[PDB]
Amino acid sequence: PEKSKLQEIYQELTRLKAAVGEL
Amino acid sequence: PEKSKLQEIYQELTRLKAAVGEL
Amino acid sequence: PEKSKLQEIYQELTRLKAAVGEL
Amino acid sequence: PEKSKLQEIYQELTRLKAAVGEL
Amino acid sequence: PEKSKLQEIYQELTRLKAAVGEL
Amino acid sequence: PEKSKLQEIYQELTRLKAAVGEL
Amino acid sequence: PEKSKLQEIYQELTRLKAAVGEL
Amino acid sequence: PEKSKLQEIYQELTRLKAAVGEL
Amino acid sequence: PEKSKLQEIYQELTRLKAAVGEL
Amino acid sequence: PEKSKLQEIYQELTRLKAAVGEL
Amino acid sequence: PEKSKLQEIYQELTRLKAAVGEL
Amino acid sequence: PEKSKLQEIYQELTRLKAAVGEL
Amino acid sequence: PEKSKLQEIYQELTRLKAAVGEL
Amino acid sequence: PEKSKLQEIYQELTRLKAAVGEL
Amino acid sequence: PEKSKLQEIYQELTRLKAAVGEL
Amino acid sequence: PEKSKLQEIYQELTRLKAAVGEL
Amino acid sequence: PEKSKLQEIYQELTRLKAAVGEL
Amino acid sequence: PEKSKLQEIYQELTRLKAAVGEL
Amino acid sequence: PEKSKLQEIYQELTRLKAAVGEL
Amino acid sequence: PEKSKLQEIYQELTRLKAAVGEL
Amino acid sequence: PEKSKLQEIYQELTRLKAAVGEL
Amino acid sequence: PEKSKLQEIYQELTRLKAAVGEL
Amino acid sequence: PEKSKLQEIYQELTRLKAAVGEL
Amino acid sequence: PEKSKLQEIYQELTRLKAAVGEL
């Protein structure tokens, strides 16, 4: 597992948090 | 921790993003 | 990072998916 | 990948779970 | 927002429809 | 809460508007 | 969609029910 | 369910309240 | 306005029709 | 109260007007 | 249509009944 | 039932009151 | 004006007709 | 009181006028 | 037609009856 | 029954009173 | 003038006719 | 009193006038 | 014809009866 | 019976009174 | 003048005729 | 008294006049 | 003819009877 | 019987009285 993978996971979570905040 | 684990995590996030987009 | 950490992360995602399915 | 990264991921999930519980 | 809220809204509408039908 | 619920609510309102227009 | 929205919808319905009861 | 749906529901209620006030 | 009001109006008219028929 | 009620009231008035015109 | 309208109609009928009783 | 209906009813009553006053 | 009044008028006329027939 | 009553009264008066004219 | 009219008619008849009784 | 009828009746009575006064 | 008056007049004439017939 | 009575009176007077003219 | 006329006629007859009784 | 009849009767009596006064 | 007077006159004439017949 | 009586009286006088003329 | 005439006639006859009784 | 008859009778008596006065 590489650093760039966890970043991409973290970045998805961020975009999921923002979507819920628009519900 | 192996690569296939983070993929499965990433893949779940994807299916969570899609579900919220149908709310 | 240890295996048990990614499992706990995966398990949280699971419980988040189920909550959204009850919205 | 370091321990502090998975913690930050876990912590985001936590704050996402709480937001959905307020929907 | 939870399921029980939309039900209570739907149930009010129902009782409003019935009242108008008695006018 | 799912999309089909708000539709059913919207559809009831529609039939309530039409009933009042016949008073 | 937030909780305060469905409340405002519910509250309008309430004031509509009361108006019809004065017809 | 999206924000624009509850608005459209709220807006219908408004036009229903106004119609009853003309009875 | 309620159903019982229009009935009472209709019933008065009836008793007015009968009175004129005795003139 | 329904449309057909006010019509029946209006129709009675009509027949009362005609009776008085024969006095 | 409002309550005060049917009252005013009912009140006119009353004064019409009384006039006929003086014929 | 609409406002214009009760007005037309009220207006007929008026013309009935005037006719009786000419008897 | 009531029925019994015109009868009393008619009845007087009758008794006037009979008186003239005795002149 | 009906039209036919006043006619019968008027008709009696007529026959009373004619009788006096033969005195 | 008003009550006072039939009275005046009745009163004339009375004075006609009395005149014939003096013939 | 109309006003003009009772007048015509009253007017006949008048002409009957005058005829008797010439007997 | 009453019937009994003209009879009394007629009866006097009769007794006058008889008196002249004895002249 | 009827016309035929005064005629019979007048006719008697006539026959009385004629009798005196033969004295 | 009035009462005072027949009296005056009756009174003349009386004075005619008395004159014949002096022949 | 009319006024002119009793006058003609009265006038005959007058001419009968005058004839007797010439006997 | 009465019948018995002319008889008494006639009777005197008779007794005058008889007296002359004795001259 | 009748005409034929005075004639019979006149006729007696005539026959009395003639008797005296023969004395 | 009046009473005083027949008396004067009767009185003449009387004076004629007395004259013949002196022949 | 008329005045002129008794005069003619009276006048005859007069001429009878005068004739006797010449006997």
Author numbering:
A (entry chain A), B (entry chain A), C (entry chain A), D (entry chain A), E (entry chain A), F (entry chain A), ...: 1 to 23
Paper text:
Further truncated forms were generated by removing the N-terminal non-repeat region or by removing this region and the first half of the first repeat unit. Gel filtration suggested that the purified truncated fragment is tetrameric, and differential scanning calorimetry demonstrated that it retains the stability of the full-length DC-SIGNR neck region, with a melting temperature of 81.7 °C compared with the measured value of 80.1 °C for the full-length neck. The structure was determined by multiwavelength anomalous dispersion phasing using crystals soaked in Pb(CH3COO)2. Within the unit cell, four molecules interact around the crystallographic 4-fold axis to generate a four-helix bundle. The four-helix bundles are translated by various numbers of repeats along the c axis throughout the crystal. This arrangement produces a unit cell with an asymmetric unit one repeat long that is an average of six nearly identical repeats. The model was further refined in Phenix to 2.2 Å. Completely conserved residues were given occupancy of 1.0, and side chains at the non-conserved positions were built with occupancy assigned based on their frequency in repeats 2 through 7: proline with occupancy of 0.83 and serine with occupancy of 0.17 at position 1 as well as glutamate with occupancy of 0.17, glutamine with occupancy of 0.33, and arginine with occupancy of 0.5 at position 15, resulting in the final refined model described in Table 2. The structure of the neck unit representing repeats 2 through 7 of the neck of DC-SIGNR is predominantly that of a four-helix bundle. The sequence of amino acids in the helical portions of the repeats follows the expected heptad pattern, with hydrophobic amino acids at the a and d positions. These hydrophobic residues are positioned toward the center of the bundle and pack against one another.
